[PDB]
Design a protein around this ligand. Sequence first.
Ligand SMILES: [Zn+2]
Ligand SMILES: [Zn+2]
Lengths: 1102, 83, 67, 48
Amino acid sequence: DEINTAQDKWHLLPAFLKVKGLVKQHLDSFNYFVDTDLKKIIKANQLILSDVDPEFYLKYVDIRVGKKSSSSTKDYLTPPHECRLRDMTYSAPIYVDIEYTRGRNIIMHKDVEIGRMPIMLRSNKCILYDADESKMAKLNECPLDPGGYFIVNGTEKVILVQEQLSKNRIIVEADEKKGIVQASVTSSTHERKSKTYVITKNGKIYLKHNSIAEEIPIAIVLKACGILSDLEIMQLVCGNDSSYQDIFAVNLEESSKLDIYTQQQALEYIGAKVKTMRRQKLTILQEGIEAIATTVIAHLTVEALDFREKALYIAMMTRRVVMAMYNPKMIDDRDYVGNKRLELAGQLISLLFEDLFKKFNNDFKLSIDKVLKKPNRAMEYDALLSINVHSNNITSGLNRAISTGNWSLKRFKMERAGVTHVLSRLSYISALGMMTRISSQFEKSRKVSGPRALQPSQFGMLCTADTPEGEACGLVKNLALMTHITTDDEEEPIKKLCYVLGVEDITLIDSASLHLNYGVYLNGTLIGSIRFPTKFVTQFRHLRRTGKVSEFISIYSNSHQMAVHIATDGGRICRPLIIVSDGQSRVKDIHLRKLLDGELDFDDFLKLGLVEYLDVNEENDSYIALYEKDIVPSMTHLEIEPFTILGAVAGLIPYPHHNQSPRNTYQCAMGKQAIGAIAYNQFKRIDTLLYLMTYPQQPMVKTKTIELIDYDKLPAGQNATVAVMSYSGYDIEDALVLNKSSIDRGFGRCETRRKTTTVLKRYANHTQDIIGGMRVDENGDPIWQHQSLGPDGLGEVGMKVQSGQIYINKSVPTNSTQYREAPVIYRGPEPSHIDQVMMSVSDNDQALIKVLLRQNRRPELGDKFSSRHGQKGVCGIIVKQEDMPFNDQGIVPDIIMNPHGFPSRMTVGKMIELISGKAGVLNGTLEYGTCFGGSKLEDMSKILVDQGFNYSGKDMLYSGITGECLQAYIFFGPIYYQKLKHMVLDKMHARARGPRAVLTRQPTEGRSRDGGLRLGEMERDCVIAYGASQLLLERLMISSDAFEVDVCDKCGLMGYSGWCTTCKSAENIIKMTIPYAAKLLFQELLSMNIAPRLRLEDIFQQ
Amino acid sequence: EKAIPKDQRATTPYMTKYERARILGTRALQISMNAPVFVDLEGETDPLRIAMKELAEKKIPLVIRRYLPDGSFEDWSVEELIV
Amino acid sequence: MIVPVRCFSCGKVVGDKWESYLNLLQEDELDEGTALSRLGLKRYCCRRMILTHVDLIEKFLRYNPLE
Amino acid sequence: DATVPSGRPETYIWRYLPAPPVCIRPSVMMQDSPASNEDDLTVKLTEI
Ligand SMILES: [Zn+2]
Ligand SMILES: [Zn+2]
């Protein structure tokens, strides 16, 4: 069949995904780190020197990860699955070349390991790179596993993509009753700061830096930065517009109000306000201190005597302020997607390793000074034993930062938490969706909902449905399917190109003509102005399409702010788009024919100028067509596939465009909790928790996404025969009816595997734990507590354990000769089965035991199920097959779901899924429910009619309990249903009496600790409103903490054992019951200087 | 500290829900403490249900002391409190 | 993992038809629909039991630990 | 109110510290190290 561009341009998405997988932000960022950023750190910190012994130095020449020069191969890395099993870190050694001087003028190289680098999965240094599923089988790794995380101490940790406002860029915001402040958060490679900028009063404009004592008025700083004419000031910040002149004139007047100014007078004024530098270089306290102040006021570091660049930057800052004061709506949305950047794992580890390497070099220099401070016999030979010992600190910090998520960077000075999370193993989709997950910047004042709303500018860049529920609702975002994140490329060769293309430098530009032409900005900085801004943009775009500049540079033109903007920084979100030229697409299906034939992989569509990346800002300048049919000859691009606006998780939904959006969001939530297949090595894995479906089925109605992400290879769910009808009355309010005898035959049958890890730790007193045990009775059989224990003292593989039995008989020394028993006891309401006992050793010659407890689980009453459309609900009743309604062929539903769930949730996608699945099973083909597409309803109805069924999927059933025809036709067909991780067996908890808090003598607060249910202030309020005083007393005093205290009648102070121990009389001591919380509060108040003396009276005597 | 004489009484002659609940609780506690019951059980063992039966027969030997906010009180037997 | 012995809804034995269905697909190739109809799977429940099954056991056996 | 003893204002200046009972600041058993772990109020009164 001939290739049709309209319906075959979608293959560019699989072409893009082949070389640029879903987990590629992490992958590329980490490869960039380990390949170039490590060299960058080692070349920044290349030499360390000592005050003493000047004829001596240490040089860091080269840096490498995982390879030596001795052999062509890399070093043996313990494979990542073995690292997972043995609770160690998947890391490769960092090798450097050291030039340390010998005392006899000898120069040599070396290959010295300075630590272990935690290697991300499936990166360049990872052993699973370019493996063919056969080496993956040999390495016990899943070929479908996403990669892009770290194994540190055996746990899978992922550095989530970080959202944050773009640095080095001007942001202007207004406010009500306070004034207009607009900042430029500028970050250097060693110093980050924000040049705040607000209007204090009277329309007066000020510059507010942290290092500056008081906000310097704007005319002062403008005069300081070389622009000292006080007319060109108003010309730069005001142009020819009349309103801005009077808006700005007040701070022009102030400039002479204090004292008339030269440049150096303003410079001295600025320098007088600099705070401190930790009292070093005290001899700089002069007019020259302002030079460092202005050098470290922004990213526009000045190394000469020309201040034009910073002057024009501050003038634009001011002019944006003046525009905002003239009228609001000239501000930028802080939630616009074009104003945010995504930090990635490689960048995070780059800065973390830079900090750790600075610490390492400081400590190495300290050790060198301590060694070489000795007067005599300063033998230089083997001066590297210190670094051999000292290599542990880099590894320790690098591992611990990933393990805990707290990143203590002393140099850059902030403490961030939650940088890493444990990779979720509830489902394959759960893991893949934890990949491509974005966490937004904290300290956001969550009381408001600015960065919680969904923006139109995130179309195609962030998934429009995968936003989580409950508390971080709108704070955690997910990447769309077809997306790229730009990488930092050098800006200097683009400035020269801009000058070539007609941009005249600002130093060649005068103030009076600056706001008469468009001004060209490179990363927010005015590099110059150009005539023909649209021609310049077109020529730049032609150069980028012909590959003369990097494909990731973005160029767009703002008309309100007369500017041509060129962005080269990394972290910008972009997506590919077909270029539409002269009203026609550039692909024209010959390229598509080549692409399916094998030629022209996705990169060649970029080299050929047929497809280009667009960031959010260029989309302002673009005009995209969704389809080839509505290409008007004024549009600039054409969507490859519009279903890519949903992420990986939202692609599990059949016909999502037929659903209300909250249903799609809730399915994005529940699909990550669905129970199913995890990996091809799931039975070789030993995880803290794992839910597995016994008989997972691929959905009958699938999408393009689920096969692009291999969801049909490890599915999580089953195609239940569903009758949509009211039945038994046990299906009201999301409750489901489950077929008994479908559960008998294995429908919904899952299992849970839990691991328990113990370490036989050695101690200082040459002593360690042992695992002996299995005592017997007088008849030779073991005691019941050891019924499944084995001679080794570790649970027998395959035997059952009930509650109270031991599967690990560990004993701990009493002087840690004599061992006290500390065995691991199974505490489970239902028995488990030992299916894997792993006996191994950690990296520190310490015995390691891991026991996997497997437990089959029948679907029961209260187990939660969901159906890919946000329609969740527990099993309300399980009924016999004969009581279930049946059709002519005797087909009987596995699940009955209420019709009342459809009208209000408005999930038409679920009905279309039922019909498409029915037509698909009857036709022998899996159907498609892709977003904005899928199998047409008329085709499915035609298939249904051809096979003898109603076109609308409504068959006539008979009642299973009366046998008669149901008076209404029942929507009958297969629907994919997922069993969710929330089972009633792990939620059923009940406590009568038991463990109590030591401090407060109240019931414990955990289900594993036999905890009680807290009766909060709200329930106390409800019981009060009922007027039930005795119930209040019983619930809050009798059944929680009842203490018989001794209270003296003379002094209102609690006694003990009928003794006041303050008057020492025991005559006035009274016995009463009060909350132990009240007793604790009184004893705490007596610890402070409060005496809460209790006065008593008789209840009786009236 | 002064009981209103029975001949005149300002409080309501009807039993409140709180009065009924507290009377049932007190009577059930007494029965659970092996107090004699003045109703025919017909094989009932629950003290609460025995107390409800006595209340239905109006054979509960308790009076309600309703204190007015001014400190006085008027006594109402369970029998005379109409439901 | 492996083909279920019975259809979840009817109870008809479908675990003895997996290999025959695979052989119908490979040797003397048929459409999936006619291959399901050739085996006797008339009801759409028995049809989906075979059509939507994912044979994960063949993938799990690639990690057999007692070779 | 100076009717009762301890109504004198000078008693409001910290002179005697009533160190709380051990039940007020329980010392937990076998955390991390085999040795018992103390708590904040105990440490502060030790330093005082
Ligand atoms: Zn006393
Ligand atoms: Zn069947």
